[PDB]
Write a protein that binds this ligand. Structure first.
Ligand code: LMT
Ligand code: ACP
Ligand code: K
Ligand code: MG
Ligand code: MG
Length: 833
């Protein structure tokens, strides 16, 4: 092996890389353009095989419709079916052209979104500590790896303390493995612990994970959005089958109708009934919504999270990450010291000493500045090693050489862990815990400092038993708008529940000034069923739903808390930040990574914020509902147009044996298809309650609207055929059996009402009251001007249509206008129940 398991070690970098650390950018480019990149491109992009050509189920039925015209014409026996057949292909060509250009445009607008969620690596280039995308990474170079980084390539650790990497999933072993200088690590691994520099070996394609991958197979096959999209497709296809395959076929021999030339009634049901617009419009609506979220501040790593975000019912929010600022502050009056000889004004300095000073943890950054002059924190101390924060240790420490060569060490950490650095007298333990609990009653978190000296003047030897120097009170404080945001979320029907590892007194005290209510519990009490605490009086699951927040949350508890809420049917949003939030984020309905979350948390989460605070999440939830509203309204529209077309033309054929022009319906479909890319760009107001995309309600809303429109179409036909009524009042013309003129009028009436239905379906109140905006009006007016012009002037024997004057068309416009107003009353009536 060139490297791998065998340790070529220090020789290997010198033999190949031939340089150390600061490797110039020009050197990377030559090997980058040679061929190394993180991973291979997906198969079948060549020749625009599926990027210029569609093949959804609806297109398959449309292909049958085109063939059916040829099939039922005996090939060249009947000429107009071929004219329809080329027309059907032209509609498919037009639909495909608009479909694929808009998705391409949406994909171009999501490049920044894809860029935001890309794997990113941290490097020092020209001596400049920098962060770069992982596709820029060069095999054989030196990189910097921090806790919770995703390892981007094979790498050999360079120097520095052992750290723990998690090989689970890649190798399927739960326990993370300690990795030492010189040892190899692999792409896709996540650091559970520690921090080290390393030399990357080979790109992910050369990594064993890339070697293992042979033949590509279905990935996320069961994705819910596609299944509901198919179900909307299934219902409209069923309606055509109910309309055509049964009843129209049923009426042919019961009444002994014409056969060969009756098939046009089947073709109109196919050509107008099938909404090939419907999958494209919904597909691009989410894509533009994600770009809106990218503007908003939320990067939808999962594109389908809009449905879950719209349906979200409860949001479990980390107090430290989302509810509170995290520029912690200490009033030194309440700092209490021990091991006197140290003093209240000086124990802050030790905390500043044990804080990193350049790239800073939020608490580290505060304490560097808390002594007023940041130079004082580092002034002449001559540090020799720094021990960085680790979640199992909860501790930092600085080792330094001072005076005549004394080796001293100072440390910060969580006080319970600091109290075990030298297990103190229980008198001391009771005293420190009393002030810690007093700070918690005050509402302030506690950090403890400690000090030791090492007599053996060496990095690797334990020093003298630690002094428990003291511990200091740190304020959260709340963000300005989180206090509003809980109220806003409550109004929008999402219950915000606090999550924190802080003891309950901190959470309630912060929570009361936040405004969240204090009916909240230690998670450990409610974890499982074995901890009692009056479980019989209130089930833990029932109590958890009632609870307004959870304190002392460990990561096992956090997964359980969402799981219990998710089992209680609630759609659970949950924020996360760290390496051990990943399973809770994965199992949550919406995993939300906070802006400063670890990349492991960003990978595990469905959605990744790039802007901090609970306020951002509620704005994203509110915006997501506004995007979600128009998917339902188009689905109501798409079903409703399908029902009116399917019912209308067959029903006149059933009653008055009237064959409608297939080409005219084809014209309606193209005009509809040309105008429905307004719908994605509408400005519907969000639903206030969460909503879960109940298909039955939207189908019920659409079918009643379409049935009413079909009924008014049938009334229009009867008015201008069997009876004299239409020309009795202001008959500029008069027609009954003038079928080519008559169906031109039917075309014009159907087209206007079909376009107007967009205004009904988008609006929740009166269609007039909710303003349309210019694009929808222009799409309506241009389409209906063209529809009017065809109705007035088209003398086409091929299309069975004869031009019927503007005065008559004006009556059709007037009839459509007075038909339109009770659509809202029908819309209100169906969605009342
Ligand atoms: C909120 C009550 C307002 C009463 C105003 C005075 C009475 C007469 C108003 C005209 C009659 C129609 O009034 C209209 O009814 C429907 C309910 O079906 C309301 O619609 C409301 O309930 C439906 C429930 O499905 C929601 O989808 C919708 O988002 C919501 O706005 C409209 O907000 C209201 O404008
Ligand atoms: N860089 C750091 N240095 C020293 N101590 C730190 C530290 N960061 C956190 N601590 C301390 O460790 C303990 C827990 O820290 P941690 O960051 O895990 O909080 P947490 O994530 O549990 C709050 P929440 O659950 O609300 O997100 C606290 O007492 C804290 O003061
Ligand atoms: K998830
Ligand atoms: Mg931190
Ligand atoms: Mg945290």
């Amino acid at each position: 092996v060139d490297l791998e398991k065998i340790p070529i070690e220090e020789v290997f970098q010198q033999l190949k890389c031939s340089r150390e650390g600061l490797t110039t950018q020009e050197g990377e480019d030559r090997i980058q353009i040679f061929g190394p990149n993180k991973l291979e491109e997906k198969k079948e992009s060549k020749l625009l095989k599926f990027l210029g050509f569609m093949w959804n189920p609806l297109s398959w039925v449309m292909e049958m419709a085109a063939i059916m015209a040829i099939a039922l014409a005996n090939g060249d026996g009947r000429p107009p079916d071929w004219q329809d057949f080329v027309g059907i292909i032209c509609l498919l060509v037009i639909n495909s052209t608009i479909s694929f250009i808009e998705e391409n445009n949406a994909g171009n607008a999501a490049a920044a979104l894809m860029a935001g969620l890309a794997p990113k690596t941290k490097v020092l280039r020209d001596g400049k500590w920098s962060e770069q995308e992982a596709a820029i990474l060069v095999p054989g170079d030196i990189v910097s790896i921090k806790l919770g980084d995703i390892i981007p390539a094979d790498a050999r650790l360079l120097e520095g303390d052992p750290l723990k990497v998690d090989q689970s999933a890649l190798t399927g072993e739960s326990l993370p493995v300690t990795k030492h200088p010189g040892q190899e690590v692999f792409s896709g691994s996540t650091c559970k612990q520690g921090e080290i520099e390393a030399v990357v070996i080979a790109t992910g394609v050369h990594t064993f994970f890339g070697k293992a991958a042979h033949l590509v197979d279905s990935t996320n096959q069961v994705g819910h959005f596609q299944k509901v999209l198919t179900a909307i497709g299934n219902f409209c296809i069923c309606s055509i089958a109910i309309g055509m395959v049964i009843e129209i076929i049923v009426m042919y021999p019961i009444q002994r109708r014409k056969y060969r030339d009756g098939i046009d009634n089947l073709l109109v049901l196919l050509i107008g009934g099938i909404p090939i617009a419907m999958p494209t419009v919904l597909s691009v609506t989410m894509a533009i919504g994600s770009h809106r979220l990218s503007q908003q501040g939320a990067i939808t790593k999962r594109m389908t999270a809009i449905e879950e975000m719209a349906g979200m019912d409860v949001l479990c929010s980390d107090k430290t990450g989302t509810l509170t600022l995290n520029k912690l502050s200490v009033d030194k009056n309440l700092v209490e010291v021990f091991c006197k000889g140290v003093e209240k004004d000086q124990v802050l300095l030790f905390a500043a000493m044990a804080s990193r000073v350049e790239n800073q943890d939020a608490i580290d950054a505060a304490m560097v500045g808390m002594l007023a002059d940041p130079k004082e924190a580092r002034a002449g101390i001559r540090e020799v090693h720094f021990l960085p924060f680790n979640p199992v240790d909860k501790r930092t420490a600085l080792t330094y050489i001072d005076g005549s060569g004394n080796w001293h060490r100072v440390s910060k950490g969580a006080p319970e862990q600091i109290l075990e650095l030298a297990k103190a007298s229980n008198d001391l333990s009771k005293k420190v815990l009393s002030i810690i609990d007093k700070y918690a009653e005050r509402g302030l978190r506690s950090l403890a400092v400690a000090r030791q000296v090492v007599p053996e003047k060496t990095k690797e030897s334990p020093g003298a038993p630690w002094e428990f120097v003291g511990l200091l009170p740190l304020f959260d404080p709340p963000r300005h708008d989180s206090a509003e945001t809980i109220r806003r979320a409550l109004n929008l029907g999402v219950n915000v529940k606090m999550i924190t590892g802080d003891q309950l007194a901190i959470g309630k005290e912060t929570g009361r000034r936040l405004g969240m209510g204090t009916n909240m519990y230690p998670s450990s009490a409610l974890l499982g069923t074995h901890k009692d605490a009056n479980l019989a009086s209130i089930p833990v699951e029932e109590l958890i739903e009632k609870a307004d927040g959870f304190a002392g949350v460990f990561p096992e508890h956090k997964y359980e808390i969402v799981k219990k809420l998710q089992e209680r049917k609630h759609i659970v949003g949950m924020t996360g930040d760290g390496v051990n939030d990943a399973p809770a984020l994965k199992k949550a309905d919406i995993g939300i990574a906070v802006a400063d979350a670890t990349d492991a948390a960003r990978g595990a989460s469905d959605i990744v914020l790039t802007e901090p605070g609970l306020s951002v999440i509620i704005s994203a939830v509110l915006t997501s509902r506004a995007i979600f509203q128009r998917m339902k309204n188009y689905t109501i529209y798409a079903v409703s147009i399908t029902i009116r077309i399917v019912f209308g033309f067959m029903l006149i054929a059933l009653i008055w044996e009237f064959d409608f022009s297939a080409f005219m319906v084809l014209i309606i479909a193209i005009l509809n298809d040309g105008t429905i890319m307004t719908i994605s760009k509408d400005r519907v107001k969000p639903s206030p309650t969460p909503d879960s995309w109940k298909l039955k309600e939207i189908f019920a809303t659409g079918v009643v609207l379409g049935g009413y429109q079909a009924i008014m179409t049938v009334i229009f036909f009867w008015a201008a055929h069997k009876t004299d009524f239409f020309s009795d009042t202001f008959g500029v013309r008069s027609i009954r059996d003038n079928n080519h003129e008559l169906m031109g009028a039917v075309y014009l009436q159907v087209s206007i009402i079909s376009q107007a239905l967009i205004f009904v379906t988008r609006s929740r109140s009166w269609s007039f009251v909710e303003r349309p905006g210019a694009l929808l009006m222009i799409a309506f007016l241009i389409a209906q001007l063209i529809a009017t012009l065809i109705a007035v002037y088209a003398n086409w024997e091929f299309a069975k249509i004869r031009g019927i004057g503007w005065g008559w068309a004006g009556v059709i416009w007037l009839y459509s206008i007075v038909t339109y107003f009770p659509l809202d009353v029908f819309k209100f009536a169906i969605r009342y129940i």
